[PDB]
Amino acid sequence: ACDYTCGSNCYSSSDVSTAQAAGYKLHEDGETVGSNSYPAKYNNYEGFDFSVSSPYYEWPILSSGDVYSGGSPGADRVVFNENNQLAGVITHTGASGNNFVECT
């Protein structure tokens, strides 16, 4: 079974941790990758009810299993905070415009 389901993509908690670990490391080094400069500040315009405190940062999680290294970010994101705590996994899939919905 999927721990997180983003549209058609299936993710296990181990997939999330690997992606999150990579994103946070770049965050610590103040470096970014990709045209959208990830990891990027996530403002939570959606108003998701995360149990961890902000600031939040979004980092692409890929259905392929590989860690994001530039190129197309796809539609899924892992959101983590400054304390490297997972806030949630969200996606553009099934969301209006450039908005996000949480993965189930």
Ligand X SMILES: Nc1nc2c(ncn2[C@@H]2O[C@H](CO)[C@@H](OP(=O)(O)O)[C@H]2O)c(=O)[nH]1
- Contact residues: Ca ion, CB under 5 A: 15, 65
Over the window 44 to 83, marking each residue x when it contacts ligand X by CB under 6 A and - when it does not, the resulting string is xxx-----------x-------------------------
List Cβ<8 Å contacts ≥24 apart for 20-24: 20/59, 20/78, 20/80, 20/84, 20/86, 22/59, 22/67, 22/68, 23/57, 23/59, 23/68, 23/78, 23/80, 24/57, 24/59, 24/80, 24/84
* Residues touching ligand X, count (CB under 6 A): 11
Does 3 sit near ligand X (CB under 6 A)? Answer: no
15 binds, among Ca ion, ligand X, none (CB under 5 to 8 A by kind): Ca ion
Closest CB to ligand X among residues 4, 57: 57
SS3 content of the chain, % helix, strand, coil (to 5): 15, 30, 55
Does 4 sit near ligand X (CB under 6 A)? Answer: no
35 binds, among ligand X, Ca ion, none (CB under 5 to 8 A by kind): none
> Which positions touch ligand X (CB under 6 A)?
36, 40, 42-46, 58, 98-100
